[model samples]
Target: GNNPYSSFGATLERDDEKNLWSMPHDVSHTEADDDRILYNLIVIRNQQTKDSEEWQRLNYDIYTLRQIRREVRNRWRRILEDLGFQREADSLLSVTKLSTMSDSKNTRKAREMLLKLAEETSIFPASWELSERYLLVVDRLIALDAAEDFFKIASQMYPKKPGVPCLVDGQRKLHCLPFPSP
Candidate 1:
């Protein structure tokens, strides 16, 4: 089920003084009241790279992700820094090969911190136990969410219905939500 807040295709009115958007209209609505806010942080797993071409416009899905990853990486980095985690200054991603060590190290540290805090705090059980890999992915997801929220920029939506997510460069679109507005 989708949360009302999680729906997409929100239209907007303009705010002349701030040169920004007015309130969103025609925003998608969902019947689901499930507010768990499950964040699915998908990555271009190497195994799928070979099979996703048919679903995406890009010849290979993973290839498409490399190009789409810029905004994701930037958002991930900003979230990490905002949370007081050590961050990269000159555009390096935490989840890539070269920086994998740093990513792992910091991820472990943050997870430990969460675990430590959970001992005294009354947070959700999932929050305390979220794995390092998952945290990084969720971090990226949250970053993507915030970017969309603050700037009203639309990133690519995943394969239009029935289009299984593909691995090619153009086809492997990143999506904010799964449903299209009526």
Candidate 2:
């Protein structure tokens, strides 16, 4: 016995006139969604690095940092394409600028503020502890549902020790052992 709502062609439930809730249909839809998830994740990491002590220690000027961000973004775009997300890959290539500040003179101060925020902001974790403390930020900044799915698929794509850390739910929280370094 199957519920009527569980049919293959079931009508979508709509939360608003512009939004309909439905499961993924086309394979590429999920693939594109997944790519968007990873794309956002990489962007976060790239921002984090902008204020990193190591990055500063290397004496990377603003131009170099922007170049690095571009390269990183493009690299992730290529990865998205390699993962069968070609249709929406161009979106991943679009550069994301530091939008918090506009004045050229305030660039240093802006970077400083970004560093502080990045440190306070939670990131993708290796284990469950303190993971929830960051979920609000992740949800606000990225797609929580998509992020979870992306990590789950990533776990399968990049094999790890059976119990290595991975995202565990639609909330984009992770739980498990330590992840291996690249």
Candidate 3:
């Protein structure tokens, strides 16, 4: 197609292979359209600020749009790495965000385990603090049935007292058990 900004002596060329825009080198001759396009390139190049909506939008857009240039792709990946780091930091900050009272799936499981341990299990932790910590270990296990295996081992070790069994075994595995019968 003919140059849209030809009157201003600024040419906008499209690269068919890469599906990118080739802006005219001379910024002095640019039109309003050219200036906007130029800023777009700069915005993507800078990748915006980490907390800015523009940065978030650009990160998403870079992933969705396949035809962006290689330079833009590199910038997008770099930003993705930064985003991942921030997310990990965010999780650390909210480390105790989910607890016994929190309405998470794990919390629900903890409540269920608490009741089942009270009614069915003969050997479980004696103290409130130890019992709470014991439930935390049970919640950590991948499956409730798998927790029974740890429970059996803990029942033997603690017997009458059955205080908070260590959270892990020799291998640092979660082997802590629940409350014992009164």
Candidate 4:
């Protein structure tokens, strides 16, 4: 029952500002709210990337999310940091700098942190160990959600329907268009 959206097309507005997009990608499947959910901090307010592509061109999908990431913010960062966790701060900040590379390996450490946090009498859960692997593959968070169809730039993850989202000149499209707005 993932992504059971009722609408075929998604449309935001004409505002051209950077907006925070939250994605429902419970990639971790830990059953926890944080479950390593996805979010797009790079989403822009404008429908397109700029006058050229910043319109209805599905390309904005690519531009808006120049990249993708999964930083366990809120409770994760504070909780881990408070416990005197070191890399917790590093992991939280690593995503912002923009260069982890393809064969990346941060997930391994975070899961270890999450596992370590499992703490004193309790055993480290099995799922988080597995969920850690979901990281890095996080690219899908943007590719699948952003303009992939009406690939909503919302706050979740999953496949797209293909209508493309955030219209150019503020209108939906029945056919696919080039990257730049024409």
Best by lDDT: 2
The model with the greater lDDT, 3 or 4, is 3
> What is the C-alpha lDDT profile of model 2 across 1-182, one tens digit per residue?
32234458556564344553333322334212432333334444455565555445334344333443334434444443355543322322232332243445432332333233223321232222112224334434333224444344333433345776786676865767788789
Candidates 3 and 4 compared: the better one by TM-score is 4
Q: How does each model score on TM-score?
A: 0.20, 0.22, 0.15, 0.18
Candidate numbers sorted by TM-score from highest down: 2, 1, 4, 3
Error of 1 at 175 (Å): 50
- Which candidate achieves the best TM-score against the true structure? 2
CA deviation > 4 Å runs, candidate 2: 1-60, 85-150, 153-182
Candidate 4, RMSD to the unseen true structure = 23.5
- TM-score, predicted candidate 1 vs. hidden true structure: 0.20
Candidate 1 off by > 4 Å: 1-60, 87-182
Q: For candidate 1, lDDT tens digit of each residue in 73-104? A: 55456664564432221122334334443323
lDDT for position 57 in model 2:
36
Better of 1 and 2 by lDDT: 2
